[PDB]
């Protein structure tokens, strides 16, 4: 049984929600019992997003195998239960890096190395590597058709369609159908022009996904069909929705999955979207409303905390609570004080690097601890929680991380190599990425929530809890809730004289989904609801 | 059984021989017992070529039904036995004229008349009119893909393909694969770029006909296939050939007809190209060689006399004579004299309008008559022969046509409505177009050549033989060999004291084919051979 | 005074002679006293041609500074006296390698690295780096407009034109104007379509260079001007020529350099092409004809020996001898013997790597030595000359290079590190690239020819003459003619019991020009003429 490919392209504009559309379609196909996966081809030159700023790119998503990937793989894992790996995301940078190394080494045997066939072959190889052994592979092409950056990807998939054959390949193209106030009509002209552009590259689209701020009526869909060599039933309306969880239903409603199953000769039962219907229901029917403050340094781009924002949303679903997420610049806490943290039912400090706004986060963790306001700290959120406690409870003056103040007396957070005590005494592979097992301390808040002794979560951090200064903070009342490895590194801390205070080193947001939620975020949003009642 | 359409387009350059290629492919399909026709879509604004100079776009071809058409319909009739009519040729001018007519009187009922759907509908309607009731319809699109003028034709046939279905429609695209001396290789890049241009208008070609001055090798055909979404077997080499009669064989040897019959699900036997093999054999195995002078006013563009040139070649085939056609400017006969008519084994004066170079043709007819050199006069060629005899034998000094000298004493050639005698006395559907019956005189040369009392030949002329001055020329020894209609108009004249001197009003070149030849031209070339032997 | 840029692009096909056209125009501009340079932007992914096979790419050209570059820089140095360096040639591979290293390091400070601005900025930087400090910079863009591979280069130079301003930038675009036999006309349609393609990328061409097998007449140039927004005087005909040395004259004849000087506001005297007129004259008026055999392993692509073929041509100019260059596969000498070396007035064995066909070259050097046939050996040509002599005169059985037979008893050629004697005894930065001074032995044939004690030539070789086995070959009659460095490496050898036998380690072909010739190649072709007389 041959692997089938759906090549997903975008026209007219970016910000179409190509990832969500691909993820939603994969959700439908998975709900028909098909083995489905998705991969993201990014046209940027970065070898991977490891070097990309949260404020410019958005969050670096981390897979089980510890790959640093586009945040779209977050969308993928939140819509299908197939696990993403390094094989599900690559950049132009990776491809050119691959080919350059093969070339300098001498693997091409004196050949002229060319965009075709050498760059295109490298792209095709990685697509087959990620795709083979599945029923359907959705291959999302980053960039916009008509731009320079995506042309090698478009040429590569054109070749793949011919080689594999059109019996097992489809081209799905997203376009913008914008509304004009003047005439009160949605416009098909950009779709007409975008399809000609895609054809000029050698690709006849099979399916058109028409993005608009409203439903694309039958007349406009018929016009698109007429001009684009596409049957009317293969022209799909995908309007702006109040919830992305509705998109699987909207696509199924227009028979998109039936068309795909027919084209690929797949006999599978009707999509059971009951789990998505349940999610849509939960979201539309909240009993309470809470305001949770996310206090961090990358707030000028919310996508910097994409998976965190979505994990809070999933916590809301499982408690039937509407979570009003307030983004509060941690630097504003330094400037204007803890008055901007007033009127919050809970507080979350997410991950980050660099000292800018960290003193604000330390002040925020203090305010949360002293006023019994529910707190969740992720990576840097655990660091500022340990610093706050060490500094203000265990009386370790100016206790900090070596990342921020390298020569500080009390480096409560530092690299395993840098570990020292207050007198400068020492003991007799630095970056941690991906899935690692963590042992939960018995009778701990997290042990209850996770409802198991051992959990698996994903790391992306360099700086650890200094084990040499740990005992002095433990004696001062702080509780180690979780540990991992032969080195017994601190994964989770708690403040037990508090309604809900948890802080973890790993990124729990990367394992949270709308359907299965997350124990930690469920507990956090519950505690936020309970706090809101007591006022 | 549904009618099948092959849309024949050209890329890179014009002058690819789109007509000869379509005609040659039609010849193969006809040899497999298929009911095949061809039609030409011309992007020029002329409502028809009736108002076009011969030196402009070539000869005006005339069908049986008296349609003035593109010379390509000459190629069609010389390659298939299916007769051409008005509905096998239309222009942009014709389409716009019909739509404007319908619009001005109010057929469109207050609608905005647009390129789509109104112009494209009109194009499709005329394609179905000429096509339906055949197995395979070849639709030649004039102009080059990428130009403005052919876009409405290309959009129209794109729509037809979708409507009729790809089960019964193919796109056959000719390109130039030019040779570069610098590198000693033929170049596929223009084909690559032309196919992207054709795709950008919404048409994926199914077959590529690669024109070059030599065979397009396997490597180049594979490269074209790789880049153009076309299977290797549908990439056809059409090199420059010494004889166009070989082209059906070249295309068949690459399985083009097999691919078409498979795609259209037509169960028909292998093509028997015996009739074309015979024509090729005749042409390659001549016994004698003759030089025939064609003395006219349009020699600067040979295609002005396309059908006449081919008729002479068909004459050669039937006699196993190799005909060297020497094009001689009739104005050079006026200036330099009969010196340039020496060394000719026969003389042909073809049709034309306007007085420029006519006196040279009259001088030429005289030279051919007085020196007993075989003479064939067509339309104007007959006028100048009558003028010659009237002026130099019947002693009617300054005898001319009213076309050239309206106020001449002896208008031996004039419109029926101008007919007057030498004293200015008179007697008591001006334009004659298409097939008309002609009665042949019992003791005439043509009666024995045609071997029938009545014949059918095609007219395109206004100015007739003046019947009022005819009997005076008849008494001077001129034979009337043929007449027609109620008004007994002179169709053929002969000089009986001469080896071979014939001149007709009609265009015998339009019914001459390479396979069936033509009685008159067969006779004329025989006389040219006989004259050559006697010298 | 601002540096002016002429961006030279190609359309329709490659193999237009973009390099020759750019080089020829630079020659004219240099002849007006302007400081002119040229650079080649190659779209291949190879970081440089160092790793490219001669049989696939052609020769690796070597500049003074020891850069391995496209053979086009050979054309540049043979048309202008400005010296080429690493700065005058770079690939897509170099640009992507630059950007990837900056990115991984962290030079982009967390930015998304994109084709625009990061790849385009890298291209612009290298163009400015090679261009600045000249009056006019010709920037040759490799690939064909309309292809994927050159788009980053085209976008980069589009930006440069806007930034620098159109007062100091011109776009010069080459196209093919092919001849069609059928109509007997050259076709402007590909030029029309190529200019639209270039405009679609954001570039309005200022100058059109029309390549054809004949002159492009005024009517066709006027048609190109009409459709392309280019004045008729900026549409240049560049027909196929029997000599590339004529091209400067043909371009000046059409005022190309006047237009450029006007557009860039350069007041400079009329181009003095006297040196080119002298070269054209010399070439057109040979007194003798010689047949020189070039016996090597890369003969299936003559461009593998591009600069060698041209150096022989320049030798012909300086002696007024027509050099008939016969390419003889050295492997055919192994198969069919020295019978295929019969009827040669001289023999040249050029550079190469690998053992394939080397035994044929050793046999060829023997035949040349024994029969007193003039011999020139370049790099591998010196190796096979030293091997032949050592093996057949000094009686060193199976004497070879360590490159070919690593464990041979007499490694007469080997790396400086590998150097051993016949008993395996040894003495108590391997690749040599670019200009190195060489000391010529007094009373040597080369000392006479070069007419100086010290010469500067360019190296590209790993394997040296083994100094430990040298004395035994010297005693056997062989003469060291040139040496270099502190290690006193053998640069040139001679056989003094021979009319003309020279072999050098360096590549003299890279310093040979049509105007100034080359002492060594002048001497070689002279000796070939003298040998031809004695028969
Ligand atoms: N390839 C094409 C397609 C169409 N048109 C012409 O496009 C014209 C209609 O222009 P509109 O109303 O702006 O476009 P719409 O298609 O209705 O798309 P929208 O949904 O954005 O309104 C017709 O005259 C035409 F003639 F149909 C054209 O000239 N060439
Ligand atoms: N769509 C395309 C197609 C090709 N190429 C690039 O085109 C380059 C080859 O250039 P050539 O030799 O002039 O083209 P050819 O295809 O061999 O066609 P011809 O038969 O006319 O010679 C490759 O580096 C490439 F990379 F393959 C490209 O960049 N984009
Ligand atoms: N952008 C354009 C340009 C031209 N044409 C149409 O192109 C037609 C002429 O077609 P040809 O004779 O093949 O082209 P040529 O320009 O003479 O170029 P060549 O030198 O290759 O012969 C006109 O009817 C037209 F109308 F002028 C067009 O439709 N759109
Ligand atoms: Na509209
Ligand atoms: Na090529
Ligand atoms: Na033309």
Swiss-Prot record, chains A, B, C:
Coiled coil: none annotated. GO terms for molecular function: ATP binding; CTP synthase activity; glutaminase activity; identical protein binding; metal ion binding. The active site is at residues 379, 507, 509. One of its GO terms (cellular component) is cytosol. Mg(2+) binds at residues 72, 140. Its EC number is 6.3.4.2. The keyword tRNA-binding does not apply. Keywords: ATP-binding, Glutamine amidotransferase, Ligase, Magnesium, Metal-binding, Nucleotide-binding, Pyrimidine biosynthesis. CTPSs have evolved a hybrid strategy for distinguishing between UTP and CTP. The overlapping regions of the product feedback inhibitory and substrate sites recognize a common feature in both compounds, the triphosphate moiety. To differentiate isosteric substrate and product pyrimidine rings, an additional pocket far from the expected kinase/ligase catalytic site, specifically recognizes the cytosine and ribose portions of the product inhibitor. This is CTP synthase. It comes from Escherichia coli O45:K1 (strain S88 / ExPEC).
């Amino acid at each position: 049984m041959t692997t089938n490919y759906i090549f997903v392209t975008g026209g007219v504009v970016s910000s179409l929600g190509k990832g969500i559309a691909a993820a939603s379609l994969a959700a439908i196909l998975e709900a028909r019992g098909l083995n489905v996966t998705i991969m993201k081809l990014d046209p940027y030159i970065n070898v991977d997003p490891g070097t990309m700023s949260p404020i410019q790119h958005g969050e670096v998503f981390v897979t089980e195998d510890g790959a640093e990937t586009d945040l779209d793989l977050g969308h993928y894992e939140r819509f299908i239960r197939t696990k993403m790996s390094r094989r599900n995301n690559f950049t132009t940078g990776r491809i050119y890096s691959d080919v350059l190394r093969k070339e300098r080494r001498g693997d091409y045997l004196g050949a002229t190395v060319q965009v075709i066939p050498h760059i295109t072959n490298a792209i095709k190889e990685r697509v087959l590597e990620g795709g083979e052994g599945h029923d359907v592979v959705l291959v999302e092409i980053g960039g916009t058709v008509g731009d320079i950056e995506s042309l090698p990807f478009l040429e590569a998939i054109r070749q793949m369609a011919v080689e594999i054959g059109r019996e097992h390949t489809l081209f799905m193209h997203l376009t913008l159908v914008p509304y004009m106030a003047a005439s009160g009509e949605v416009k098909t002209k950009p779709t007409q022009h975008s399809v000609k552009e895609l054809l000029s590259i050698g690709i006849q689209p099979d399916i058109l996904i028409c993005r608009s701020d409203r439903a694309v009526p039958a007349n406009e869909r018929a016009k698109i069909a007429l001009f684009c060599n596409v049957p009317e039933k293969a022209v799909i309306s995908l309007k702006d929705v109040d919830s992305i969880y509705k998109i699987p239903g909207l696509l199924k409603s227009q028979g998109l999955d039936d068309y795909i199953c027919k084209r690929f000769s797949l006999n599978c039962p009707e999509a059971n979207l009951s789990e998505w219907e349940q999610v849509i229901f939960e979201e539309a029917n909240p009993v309470s409303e809470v305001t949770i403050g996310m206090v961090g340094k990358y707030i000028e781009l919310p996508d910097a905390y994409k998976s965190v924002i979505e994990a809070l949303k999933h916590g809301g679903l499982k408690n039937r609570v509407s979570v009003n997420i307030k983004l509060i610049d941690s630097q504003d806490v330094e400037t204007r004080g803890v008055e901007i943290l007033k009127g919050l039912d809970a507080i979350l400090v997410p991950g980050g690097f660099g000292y800018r706004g960290v003193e604000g986060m330390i002040t925020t963790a203090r305010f949360a601890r002293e006023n019994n306001i529910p707190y969740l700290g992720i990576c840097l959120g655990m660091q500022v929680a340990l610093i706050d406690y060490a500094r203000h409870v265990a009386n370790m003056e100016n206790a900090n991380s070596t990342e921020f103040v390298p020569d500080c007396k009390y480096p409560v957070v530092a690299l395993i190599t840098e570990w020292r005590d207050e007198n400068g005494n020492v003991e007799v592979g630095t970056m941690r990425l991906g899935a690692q097992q963590c042992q939960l301390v018995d009778d701990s808040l997290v042990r209850q929530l996770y409802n198991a002794p051992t959990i698996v979560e994903r790391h992306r951090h360099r700086y650890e809890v200094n084990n040499m200064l740990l005992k002095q903070i433990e004696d001062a009342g702080l509780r180690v809730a979780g540990r991992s490895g032969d080195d017994q590194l601190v994964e989770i801390i708690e403040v037990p004289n508090h309604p809900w205070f948890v802080a973890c080193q790993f990124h729990p947001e990367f394992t949270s989904t709308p359907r299965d939620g997350h124990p930690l975020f469920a507990g956090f949003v519950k505690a936020a609801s309970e706090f809101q009642k007591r006022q």
